[PDB]
Structure 1
Amino acid sequence: RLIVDEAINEDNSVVSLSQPKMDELQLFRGDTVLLKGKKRREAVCIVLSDDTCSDEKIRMNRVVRNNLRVRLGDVISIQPCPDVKYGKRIHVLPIDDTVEGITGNLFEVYLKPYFLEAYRPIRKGDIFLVRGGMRAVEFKVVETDPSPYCIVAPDTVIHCEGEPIKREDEEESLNEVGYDDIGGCRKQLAQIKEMVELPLRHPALFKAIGVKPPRGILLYGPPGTGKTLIARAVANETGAFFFLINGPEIMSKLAGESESNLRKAFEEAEKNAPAIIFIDELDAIAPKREKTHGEVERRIVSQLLTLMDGLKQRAHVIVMAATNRPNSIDPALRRFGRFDREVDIGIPDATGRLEILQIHTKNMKLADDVDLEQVANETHGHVGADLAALCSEAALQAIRKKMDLIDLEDETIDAEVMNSLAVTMDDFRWALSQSNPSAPRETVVEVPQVTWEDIGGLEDVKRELQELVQYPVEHPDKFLKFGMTPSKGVLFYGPPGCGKTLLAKAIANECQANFISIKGPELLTMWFGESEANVREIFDKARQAAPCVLFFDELDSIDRVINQILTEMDGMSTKKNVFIIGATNRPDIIDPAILRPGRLDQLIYIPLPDEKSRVAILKANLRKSPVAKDVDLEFLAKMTNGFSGADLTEICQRACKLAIRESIESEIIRRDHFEEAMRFARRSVSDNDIRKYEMFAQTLQ
């Protein structure tokens, strides 16, 4: 009766029950209930209040998913459990494959933090684990002295056997990653989750329904951002067959038998249906250019291009793909009858890298000194692969800080003193101090975090923009009711540094669209490097970041780029909920062909901020720390004649630097520095441009 979904909350024997589901089988919050299972399983779980999921589809752990031994995601009923019993005398035994060489009696030191105060309902022969210090243990119950469904009690004792049991292939392994184990981009992982799940649900559906399967999924993007393990993860989440197809192993062999290797791998893939297959590094496979010297690499792109169509299509198997650049791939694979709809997960944002930290905190056994939101701060432009390498380097320095100097080893390898050891704060700073910028620094695709409340001033322009980014995507039917279409181009001009770049985050954070920050200089390097294919590719993968917005500033630097943005804006995406910001500081020197209707045309002059607006911007600048309110903010904005938001930030930055200067010059706070910043020599404001910007406004009139 009840369907399984994925749960963020990783505590096992916990059901995230919806509140309308409470009264059907009489469930209470602290209590636990039985579950149905394939080959007669019983799962026992305590109720978590989670109403935002479905009544039938309920978020569950992947460890209780592995406990069920279901394929996955299937419907199972709930039996109520009024025959709960605590009892005693439960013999608990580990499995051998988890034991990587952990010495001796690990029983009490791992069971006792796991078993105290949890009262965790535990069936006979079930599977569950803990994580910590790069490995902790799986525990399986041999027998129970009460009923085969049982509950942990504080008087439950074990025999400390010291001998793990031999593993089985029936259980899904715990190093086999899952949906919650990947934390790059949740909605994009949702896109790849219900992109191709219908063969993963039922092969007999596409053996019985004439709808063609989505044939081939490609994940271009950053280099090696878990993409092979993403395919491995969804292969574990369907429970079907997978075998890895390495990219360079196609080029490993000589000519002829490499064809035989790849083709016989493809044939045994069809033999082992239901299955998913994945090829990594197709740019190593198909870089179809003038750089394709020789002919056996054309033979390598052949038989892959055959067996795409040489799929029988009664065979329901699915090919998975990943690379770095989509345009670097051979262009005959873009269409239909070929690789299907493709996506990039991209660089994860601050929240996504925070989530990859919390999935990496689980197997760390870390102390409460670290918080790692500070790690989530400066991880911009850094791949979570390199974050995992940084966490590994942190663990290596932690086991290099102690236990290589405590010297409790000659051949003994105590993991318990390694778990009592913990990674600390300056250890994480030192781990940050190694080669983290090995990730490329490109433009970032991120769901925004700076809210509309962080910017005050120009509320009429803000009301116009809040109309523009929300009412087309709330009411497109009311837009086309009167026969009209929403616009896509807006104009931003005036003195620089007023906060126009600052509101670009808030205008997408309010409507909950996606944000991409397109800046002039890297477009100029693409134009000088003649890589305008990369410009239309970042435009196109912005278009597949729907719903999104296109913020572009300093457009007066261009001359090809204006012609290509006129080409790509002709094929606009009306129903993908996109919008384009045209921003500059010198609007007069750009060509007037761009301001035509049907193009970026909605002219709004963006003035320099007012005094109450400057008070709001100064307040938002001082919201990063507790700043004393002894200095009035209107007098800070009183002498500001044309001091923009950049001027306000550098004034408050000078106040902060002088405050910390007098803070640490003492021998081993606000008012004096604010008065110094208001009463220093410099008043560096460009004031001549207001007259010509008002001349432009009177030209529009």
Structure 2
Amino acid sequence: RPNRLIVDEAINEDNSVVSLSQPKMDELQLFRGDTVLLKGKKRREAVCIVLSDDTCSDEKIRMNRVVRNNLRVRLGDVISIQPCPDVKYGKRIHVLPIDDTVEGITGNLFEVYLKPYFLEAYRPIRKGDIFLVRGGMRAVEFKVVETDPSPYCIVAPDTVIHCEGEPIKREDEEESLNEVGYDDIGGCRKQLAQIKEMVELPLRHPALFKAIKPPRGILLYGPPGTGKTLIARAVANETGAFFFLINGPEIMSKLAGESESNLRKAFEEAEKNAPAIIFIDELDAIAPKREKTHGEVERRIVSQLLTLMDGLKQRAHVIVMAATNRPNSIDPALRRFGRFDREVDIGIPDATGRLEILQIHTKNMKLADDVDLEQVANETHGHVGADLAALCSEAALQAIRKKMDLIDAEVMNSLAVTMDDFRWALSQSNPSALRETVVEVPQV
């Protein structure tokens, strides 16, 4: 059926735009800017607006995280899209925030988030939809409790929006957008694509590998703070695979016998929630080079980890990935075929990568017009994603301390980060990877 399309990530950051290839748009007779009624898995309906996208496959339909969650759909699923011309300018629309994202923020959540979000953009709205509004360095959720034309509606400047406070609790079915997604990782687009091609099919369609081998071990290595844990969490969340973090320090802290039992039960629990991803953070802490270890219990724990990784073979649909700084950091016999057979190098973000990371970490922040992330991204040489996040946080703190001399959401949204704050943060940047080898595509 032509209306069936495979979901994909959206470059357009707008919350209510569905990107399509022009061939598919004309095949569907869909005109840019028209409303479309996407159909989800559990009878979820999302009213969005279709925009052509040159870099999009005909079958592929690009959607934002918010739209995906509204439809309870993950990347690679199939959704039904058809035009919905029967859209009316609803007058009474009752919208509420979500408690988990409005804690510690006061002031009416209108004229701060909702009003600028709608204003006059004529964003389509459907009953029960969840949408995210960024402002005041916070991403506030909102649930469309009611719409005047049940259920589809399109906001209008004369539309009356009711926000009676009383934030509603998050229903377990809903997946908070505060969770990590593929859009929360920047710089490592190539490595993220590699991990996608590596792990998407085993996690999304385990039965196929059950019939027709799958990758069981992926070793993400690079300078610390590059978001390896972030990448693993994003992959687990997007693929709907149970995630289990095994911090190396956590295991080493446990007394002898306690640590091995903890590791074994972690592996067993991950197996029982298949498909699942087990993230062995700081693997070098658990299994360092043979020379480094000088303890019977340490060698016992390394052997136990090896035995569990081997035992994954008789198991299935479980992908173990770990974080390190260099393959030689961990002992050999862990990269042997099977256990941790695949490798990935997150590396240092490049100029474009640093710009992408800065944009990701400054989404909620309101930065003045004079702030140009390109110039700073050029300035920040040898900065890791964690360093860029810390720099953005420092700029925000600078702005906050400056404004404090003169929390109300209106005040928070009033303050704007200026290029002077970013320059000061640079002066206090303190890069963490200024000595690592530089690998990128030259801009010269």
The verdict on a shared fold, with TM-score over 0.5 as the criterion, is yes
CA distance in 2, matches of 1:338, 1:181: 28
Per-residue CA distance 1:310-345 (angstroms, 9 max, x = gap):
115342211111111210111101221221220102
Alpha-carbon distance, 1:429 to partner: 1.0
Alpha-carbon separation, structure 2, partners of 1:246 and 1:30: 47
Give the C-alpha shift of residue 288 in structure 1: 2.4
Q: Which has the higher contact order (CA 8 A, sep 6+)?
A: 2
CA contact (8 A) 2:25 2:52 kept: no
Structure 1 residues 402, 108: closer, same or farther in 2, change over 3 A? closer
Assess, with a 3 A threshold, how the Cα gap between structure 1 residues 214 and 312 changes in structure 2: closer, same or farther: closer
Q: Does structure 2 conserve the Cα–Cα contact (< 8 Å) formed by 1:104 and 1:162?
A: no
| 1:286–1:301 CA contact under 8 A, matched in 2 | yes
2:175 is aligned with 1:181: no
Quote the residue 1:113 is aligned against. 116
The DSSP-based 3-state class of the residue aligned with 2:379 is coil
* Aligned mates of 1:396, 1:95 — CA distance in 2: 26
Instruction: Report the Cα offset of residue 44 of structure 1.
Output: 1.9
Mapped partners of 1:69, 1:303: distance in 2: 38
Structure 2 residue runs without a partner (length 5+): none
Q: Answer whether contact 1:250 1:300 (CA < 8 A) is retained.
A: no
In the alignment, what sits opposite 1:571? none
Give 1:279 shift. 0.5
Secondary structure, counterpart of 1:309 in structure 2: helix
Deviation at 1:103, TM superposition (A): 1.0
Deviations along 1:592-646, one digit per CA (max 9) or x if unpaired, are: xxxxxxxxxxxxxxxxxxxxxxxxxxxxxxxxxxxxxxxxxxxxxxxxxxxxxxx
SS at match of 1:217: strand
Whether the 8 Å contact between 2:354 and 2:383 is mirrored in structure 1 is no
User: RMSD across aligned C-alpha pairs, in angstroms?
Assistant: 2.2
Does 2:229 align with 1:228? yes
Instruction: Note closer, same or farther for the CA distance 1:19–1:435 as it changes in structure 2 (3 Å cut).
Output: closer
Cα distance in 1 for residues equivalent to 2:383 and 2:85: 51
CA distance in 1, matches of 2:75, 2:62: 13
**C-alpha deviations, 1:497-518, integer Å up to 9, x for none?**
xxxxxxxxxxxxxxxxxxxxxx
TM-fit CA distance, 1:100:
2.4
Distance 2:139 2:231 in 1: 23
How many Å apart are 1:405 and its aligned residue?
4.2
3-state SS of the aligned residue for 2:298?
A: helix
Q: Which has the higher strand share?
A: 2
After superposition, the C-alpha distances for 1:203-224 in whole angstroms (9 at most, x for unaligned) are: 1112222xx1111111111112
Query: Quick one: distance in 2 between partners of 1:52 and 1:429?
Result: 35
Residues 114-148 of structure 1: per-residue CA shift (max 9 Å, x gap): 00121111111011111133213111111111130
Question: TM-score, normalized by length of structure 2?
Answer: 0.96
- Provide, for residues 637-681 of structure 1, a one-character-per-residue CA deviation record: whole Å limited to 9, x for no partner: xxxxxxxxxxxxxxxxxxxxxxxxxxxxxxxxxxxxxxxxxxxxx
Query: 1:29 aligns to what SS in structure 2?
Result: coil
- SS of 1:312's partner is coil
Counterpart of 1:180 in 2: which secondary structure?
helix
Q: Secondary structure at the match of 2:253?
A: coil
- What's the offset of the Cα at 1:27? 0.8
Which aligned segments of 4 or more residues in structure 1 are displaced greater than 3 angstroms? none
Contact kept in structure 2, 1:203 and 1:316, CA below 8 Å: yes
- Cα deviation, 1:358-408, whole Å, max 9, x if unaligned, reads 1122110222121121111111211121011010000011011112449xx
Does structure 2 conserve the Cα–Cα contact (< 8 Å) formed by 1:67 and 1:126?
A: yes
The question of whether the paired residues in 2 share the 8 Å contact of 1:241 and 1:275 is answered with yes
Match of 2:424 among 427, 430, 435: 430
State whether residues 72 and 239 of structure 1, in contact with CA within 8 Å, keep that contact through their aligned partners in structure 2: no
Deviations along 1:47-92, one digit per CA (max 9) or x if unpaired, are 2221221001122211211111124320112122121112210000
Partner residue in 2 for 1:293:
294
CA displacement at 1:151 relative to structure 2: 1.0
- Structure 1, residues 267-323: CA drift from partner, whole Å, max 9, x if none? 111111121110111111111232211211101112110011111534221111111
For 1:117 and 1:361, the matched residues in 2 are separated by: 24
CA distance in 1, matches of 2:241, 2:6: 19
Deviation, 1:419, is 1.3
CA distance in 1, matches of 2:431, 2:241: 37
Query: Post-superposition shift, 1:25?
Result: 3.0
SS of match in other structure, 2:160: coil
2 CA distance for matches of 1:148 and 1:357? Answer: 38
Q: Is the 8 A contact 2:310 2:339 kept in 1?
A: yes
In structure 1, how many angstroms separate the alpha carbons of the residues matched to 2:338 and 2:315? Answer: 15
Q: What secondary structure is seen at the aligned counterpart in 1 of 2:6?
A: strand
1:178-208, Cα deviation, whole Å (9 max, x unpaired): 1121112212211111111112221111222
Moved more, 35-44 or 348-357: 35-44
Superposed displacement of residue 437, structure 1: 2.3
Q: Please give the alpha-carbon distance, in whole angstroms, between the structure 2 residues aligned to 1:223 and 1:22.
A: 44
Q: Is the 8 A contact 2:16 2:49 kept in 1?
A: yes
Which of these residues, 136, 142, 145, is aligned with residue 142 of structure 1?
A: 145
Q: Tell me whether 1:332 sits opposite 2:322 in the alignment.
A: no
Assess if the C-alpha contact under 8 Å between 2:39 and 2:79 holds in 1: yes
Question: Partner of 2:236: helix, strand, or coil?
Answer: helix
Q: How many equivalent pairs are there?
A: 440
8 Å CA contact 2:47, 2:124 repeated in 1: yes
Is the 8 Å Cα contact of residues 207 and 314 (structure 1) preserved in structure 2?
no
How far residue 235 of structure 1 moved from its aligned partner, in angstroms, is 0.8
Query: Any conservation in 2 of the 1:103–1:415 contact (CA below 8 Å)?
Result: yes
Is the CA contact (8 Å cut-off) linking 2:349 and 2:385 kept in structure 1? yes
8 Å contact kept, 1:95–1:139: yes
